[PDB]
Symmetry: D3
Subunit: 31 residues, 6 copies
């Protein structure tokens, strides 16, 4: 799954492996 470090993002490729960019503008797991 996605690391739980808070990282702001605008798109999914901004995030670490396993993550997508959530509607809150942070990297998160895609569940």
């Amino acid at each position: 799954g996605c690391p739980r470090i808070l990282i702001r993002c605008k798109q999914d490729s901004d995030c670490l492996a396993g993550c997508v960019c959530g509607p809150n503008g942070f990297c998160g797991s895609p569940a």
Copy 2:
């Protein structure tokens, strides 16, 4: 999954969620 950031460790609890302290003294995925 363990995050793939390189983190030096002594013991498993030094590591982020999903990780253990591997043979080579870095955090990594179990086995």
Copy 3:
């Protein structure tokens, strides 16, 4: 001390060395 990177957690072992999982679900110093 606990590094001042914001990381969400469920239990203490989710956090980096020096940190515990606070009642707000973020890593921090046991102080």
Copy 4:
């Protein structure tokens, strides 16, 4: 530019390269 990881700071040197300490005590891009 400053990495978009949430990191608390009291002064710019607390942050990663490219970053300054913003008005709310987190690391961010200058200006």
Copy 5:
């Protein structure tokens, strides 16, 4: 523009914003 945190990768999307996955299997700045 790539943060200088050492992160191992298999593909560019594994890396933070501004980074690509070098032939070295680490996140780094592109050309």
Copy 6:
């Protein structure tokens, strides 16, 4: 002290709070 995340550095200001740029070229505890 300093987090044990590997961060490459040229100077101390490249590092997180409590850290300096050590002779190994990485941020560490002073």
